[PDB]
Amino acid sequence: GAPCQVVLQGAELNGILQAFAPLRTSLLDSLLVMGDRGILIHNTIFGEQVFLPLEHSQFSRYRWRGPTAAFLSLVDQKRSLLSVFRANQYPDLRRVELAITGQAPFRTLVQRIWTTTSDGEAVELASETLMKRELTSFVVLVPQGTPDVQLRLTRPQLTKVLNATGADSATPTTFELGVNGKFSVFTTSTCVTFAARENAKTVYGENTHRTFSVVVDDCSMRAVLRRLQVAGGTLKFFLTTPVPSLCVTATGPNAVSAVFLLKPQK
Amino acid sequence: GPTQRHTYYSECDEFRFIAPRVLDEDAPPEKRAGVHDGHLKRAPKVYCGGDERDVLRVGSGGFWPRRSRLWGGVDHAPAGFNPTVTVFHVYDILENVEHAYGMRAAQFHARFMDAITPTGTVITLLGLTPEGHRVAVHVYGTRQYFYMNKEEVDRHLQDLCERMAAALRESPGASFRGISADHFEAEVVERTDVYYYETRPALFYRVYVRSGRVLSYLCDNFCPAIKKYEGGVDATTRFILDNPGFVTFGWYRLKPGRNNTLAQPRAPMAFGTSSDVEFNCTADNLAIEGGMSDLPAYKLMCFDIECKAGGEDELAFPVAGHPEDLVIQISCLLYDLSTTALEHVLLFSLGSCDLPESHLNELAARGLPTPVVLEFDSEFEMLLAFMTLVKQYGPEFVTGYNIINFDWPFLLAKLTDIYKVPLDGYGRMNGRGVFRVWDIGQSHFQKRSKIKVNGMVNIDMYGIITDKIKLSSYKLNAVAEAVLKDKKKDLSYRDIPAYYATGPAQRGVIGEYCIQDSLLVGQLFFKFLPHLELSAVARLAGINITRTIYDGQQIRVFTCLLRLADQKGFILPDTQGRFRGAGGEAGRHVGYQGARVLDPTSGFHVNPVVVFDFASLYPSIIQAHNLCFSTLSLRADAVAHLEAGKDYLEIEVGGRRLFFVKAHVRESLLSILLRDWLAMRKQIRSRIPQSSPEEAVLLDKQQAAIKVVCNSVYGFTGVQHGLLPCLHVAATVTTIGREMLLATREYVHARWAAFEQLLADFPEAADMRAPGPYSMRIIYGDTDSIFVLCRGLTAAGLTAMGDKMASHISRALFLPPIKLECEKTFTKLLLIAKKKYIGVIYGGKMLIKGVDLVRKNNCAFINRTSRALVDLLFYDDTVSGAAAALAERPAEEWLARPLPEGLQAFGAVLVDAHRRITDPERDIQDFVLTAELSRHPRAYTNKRLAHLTVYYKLMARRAQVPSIKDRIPYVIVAQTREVEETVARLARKLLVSELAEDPAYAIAHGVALNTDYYFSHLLGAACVTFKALFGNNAKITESLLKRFIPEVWHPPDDVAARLRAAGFGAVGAGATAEETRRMLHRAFDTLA
DNA sequence: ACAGATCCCCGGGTACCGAGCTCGAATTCG
DNA sequence: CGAATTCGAGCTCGGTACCCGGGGATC
Ligand SMILES: [Mg+2]
Ligand SMILES: [Mg+2]
Ligand SMILES: [Mg+2]
């Protein structure tokens, strides 16, 4: 019936339930952008950009046709299209059916939930099922390119770095990879240093030789990255282009990422 | 010379020349701004065509119509001028307390000199002789009088003993003096108190006072323990109720009353009122002769003010007290009130004035007299000419637009403060008269700003059009547009002293706007003819016209009750110590339970909803069960000699179990008072079926205006601290009302709820059966209605038979005066809330009853759009079907399943209303909210109010300060950083109160409006009416109605400049539609 | 020196508790 | 030795109840 039918069947659904769980009540003001390739989730968190791809393999099957739609997630302005995945709401879940039946401008998306009943049974609760509608005209600025030094900065040390950052605008922190892979987060208060490679200070990345020094002037980096509560697992660095961008990705089952703008250097 | 001397300027040689020093171009550009000041030794002067005639020289013949016979004594009438008059028309009765030593050269007859002999009260009747002469007939010998129990005056004090006591008991802190035996009379008379059926006749002293001091005795001075019985009745009412049949606006005749005594014209030099022929009849030389039904050429004047403001700021609304803010020019149209004719179109100007030839030609092309423009060099010498016109020409009726608030108080404030000239003589009596404007704005308890002038009936049209039409903003431009289908061209004040500083060719444009304004006023007065409609109630009540315009509704009802009281051996007690002594026991006070509102079965109701209405319910409960004070026995001793059910009624009203006596052992006064008024509303409802569809609407509002004065009977009873409060009768009235509705519902449900019982009672319904299943189910009531949803019946003749149901239920349940009527039948009624409903009458007009679209606050823009949504629901067809389809599923179940494909037309007007709000080419005057000031703004408990905020913004920037009860316009201006330093300088998601702004200030300074406020308010209005379809919860509708509106997202632009600069891609609208997909495909590989 | 009534719904502006929020200064736990 | 849980204190802001006040409906 609906051309664009996407379903989360139980094994994959408990995959994405754990992927969404850590980000408690963040991204429930998201903007879901859905195209042929999955679904991407966007938001401003402490005035900074944050993203979450949901590519096909994540959930059971995806089928989509026509223009990419964008659904301003907060549905009826208190309830949220992604509430279903908060990992303690609707606890013993089963198949969730996102489908959109419209045509191109005025698409509308129905989130149908199903809830176990312990025989193998399940009750579709058509009491909390959601009905959103496509934003008519939506412009969202999405990261692009390929980073030039992606290092894997793992779970402890991505606390060390955010603590190494400072409180307010007085004190700009400075990421500076030097020759032979120093990768130090310098600032007036304290400094954290690493080995950059291709014994638990071996920060594994690739093509790290392309030296940079960059300075982060947003005081928010600890704020948002902690708010997301990432386990770390990569800093993505885009140096080439003006106002180089520091994005940061986690490596658990989720892929939430947060682009940090930086002041002109390298 | 005269005996009663005249107190109106008849001569002058010194005044306060004030003349803005722009009229004299013999000074360079430095002495242009400002105004002169300083006395002069010339007698004042008017130029009209290039003639000089000192303003106060009656004689050769003036630039104005002289309609007087006297001027400063010197009789200016043709010699031998002795009209005989015996049929005169009276419009205003005055009381004046003249004296015997004050009139000795009057040469009266001895009868008259005896009437006043110490002093006395002389009722001047005042009017026109049909030929045209202004007659003033002075009627002597009318004494006001108050009664007092014989016992209580025989203990507190302990006939001539009484008056000798009371005469000098007044003495302390003298304001009276020389008060002797001959100033009061007692006589023992035998009468019953009005209250309760148990109350026996007793013996009272009738105290006849000589003049206008009863109010002292009836004030707490004399003896507070003694209950004075009727002390508020005037000399005038004691003249109108005891001479039988006399009416205070009606033709009289002058008859040789008794002894063959004869009325006595005065000599011209003893005239108490500047009029042509004056007479000294007594109480009973008059007769009331009828059959003559005419209105004798009373000259209505219709005048306006235009005022300038000077000294150091020109864009400042002028203020009366300032010697420099000064009146420039005033229209004065003079009409004839018998033929609706216009003559003489006078305009008074301060200095040279022309008039554009367009104005003179438009007027002559309308058959209106050529304007007469009088050029006065000095402002005082203008406002003396103007109140020499209103004392020589002597308009009986006066009119204006906002005369009570801005025109007259400016003019009088300017005379009395700044030029110090008595206004007491410029009324109709040439000395010791009343010329007063009472403003409400004195932190007070009244609702009227009253002007009383001595013998002139100041019918303002702001009152009248604020009681006849339900219009958001009552400024003359808008009321001319709405009421006359006209297009007026305004002149905002701000540009007045730019048209004045130029030569006369722009003072002419000011005179154009004055005359064209006051001719419009004249047109509204003759459209609504207030003088006839207030005349009818002045006749019916006994109050003057001047007291039926400005003194509320307890007085007309008390006065009719007083004429019924003192013909039945009754006396009407006077309770005093009113509310600033309050109720004596040593948020809004509801003195009793008032009415029922049955629960509305909220919903759209496609089936015929046939309404039944009691016909003026309360006044037929004060008659069906003869509820008055006089039958109120509220104990059970005095109704013991009569039997239950046939001679009295028991009603637990508050728990009291009042016993109300039946009709044949005592008859009410409220039942009998109401019988006269009801036939008056019955004649004004008679005339409706035979009139024009626009002259029917004025005889619709005259019958509503008497529905209020008949139901005021009930009201007047139920007031607290009023003139005759009896909350027992009012509580009962409402009790029987609530009961009568529940009786009707337990009869319509039990009797007619199987269709075969309809067929056995009205066999004309055999063919009225529409196919569906039958149910007669009352779904709504109100103080009289009962909306009977009749399901399974065709609407075609449901009013045909419904006249029969309303005649069956009436006869079968209620007493014969009570009449249930089937006034309407709706099809497609929407029952949104308790007193709110929209429904389309059978085959035609829509009845919108109070849904935030029938009320004066809400912005015009939002009223046009919900007014189109209601049409898209009732009149349209797919939408009506769809709306009815939104009953199949509870409210919750439309938040998932889409709206059933008929309402895509409903939503279009919401997305389109949202598209229009955002356009930068909006017109502020379409987005203007407005709300009533309603109180002195310092008496407000809650001071953080939108309109209040705009009232202080107005008054702070020297602008027009809207007098109490003026609708304050206010548009809500965008929240910006200039609406946030202004609050802080005057002191952060700002309240709607502190974004209020006057639209004059919102157009001259190009401020944005809130497009969040006004659209959230449009969905607020839409939601309140349309909740009724969805379940009647406003949260579901608010969530479903706004789903229609497209939502759009962009990064806050500068951030996009930075992001773009960071080399991101824009994905959507800001690109075109094939730049979004390809690059958003790349972004995924980036983050993946 | 003045003077019909009550009932009723919304909207704006307060002033709570509170349920849900992360966000820490001890922690129990590896 | 380790730095990985917690039940405490700060948050919002929903959403209650409140008043008021505007302004209808009904007599
Ligand atoms: Mg005016
Ligand atoms: Mg009625
Ligand atoms: Mg009727």
Automatic annotation (TrEMBL), chain A:
GO biological process, one term: DNA replication
Subcellular location: Host nucleus
Keywords: DNA replication, DNA-binding, Host nucleus
Stated name of the protein: DNA polymerase processivity factor
Molecular function GO terms recorded: DNA binding
GO terms under cellular component: host cell nucleus
Keyword set includes DNA-binding: yes
UniProt KW Amino-acid biosynthesis keyword: no
Organism: Human herpesvirus 1 (HHV-1)
Family under the similarity heading: Belongs to the herpesviridae DNA polymerase processivity factor family.
Full-sequence range covered: 28 to 319 of 488
Automatic annotation (TrEMBL), chain B:
Binding site for Mg(2+) 1: 304
Residues covered by the DNA polymerase catalytic subunit Pol C-terminal domain: 1053-1088
GO cellular component: host cell nucleus
Residue span(s) of domain DNA-directed DNA polymerase family B multifunctional: 543-1028
Binding site for Mg(2+) 2: 304, 401, 407
Keyword DNA-binding among record annotations: yes
UniProt entry keywords in alphabetical sequence: DNA replication, DNA-binding, DNA-directed DNA polymerase, Endonuclease, Host nucleus, Hydrolase, Metal-binding, Multifunctional enzyme, Nuclease, Nucleotide-binding, Nucleotidyltransferase, Transferase, Viral DNA replication
List of residues binding Mg(2+) 6: 613, 784
E.C. no: 2.7.7.7
Alphabetical list of Gene3D superfamilies matching this protein: DNA polymerase family B, C-terminal domain, DNA Polymerase, chain B, domain 1, Helix hairpin bin, Palm domain of DNA polymerase, Ribonuclease H-like superfamily/Ribonuclease H
Residues reported in the UniProt entry to bind Mg(2+) 7: 613, 821, 823
Subunit description: Forms a complex with the ssDNA-binding protein UL29, the DNA polymerase processivity factor, and the alkaline exonuclease. Interacts with the putative helicase-primase complex subunit UL8; this interaction may coordinate leading and lagging strand DNA synthesis at the replication fork.
Family classification: Belongs to the DNA polymerase type-B family.
Name of the protein in its database record: DNA polymerase
Source organism of the structure: Human herpesvirus 1
Lineage, highest ranks first: Viruses, Duplodnaviria, Heunggongvirae, Peploviricota, Herviviricetes
